[PDB]
């Protein structure tokens, strides 16, 4: 099939059809209630949550050479 002859495989039609559906799936995406919520969870909320925690706690601590009677809290 390709430029260089390979071994003979039992190219299963069902598995071939499955691997083509995956490669073509992007053409059939649609905006629905489900697809809008999932795409909003992963892209906005969860990243903005991490960004909130990263922003809120940036500089909150330093562990370097901390001793008894001296806290880890930096701010």
């Amino acid at each position: 099939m390709a430029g260089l002859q390979h071994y003979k495989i039992a190219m299963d039609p069902a598995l071939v059809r499955l691997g083509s559906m995956i490669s073509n799936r992007y053409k059939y995406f649609r905006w629905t209630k489900r697809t809008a919520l999932v795409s909003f969870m992963y892209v906005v909320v969860v990243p903005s949550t991490i960004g909130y925690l990263a922003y809120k706690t940036d500089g909150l601590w330093d562990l370097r050479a901390k001793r008894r009677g001296d806290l880890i809290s930096e701010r």
């Binding site: 059809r17 559906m21 073509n24 799936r25 053409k27 059939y28």
Partner: protein
């Protein structure tokens, strides 16, 4: 004053069919996988 095969949107429609971009419905393609049973 110019022929259709040079300026017509008809030839553009043949060169770029609207069908080349598959649009469907939850009815025939609920799983958005192209109608894969």
């Amino acid at each position: 004053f110019l022929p259709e095969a040079m300026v017509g949107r008809s030839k553009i429609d043949e060169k770029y069919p609207d069908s080349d971009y598959p649009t469907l419905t939850d009815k025939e393609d609920p799983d958005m996988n192209g109608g894969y049973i």
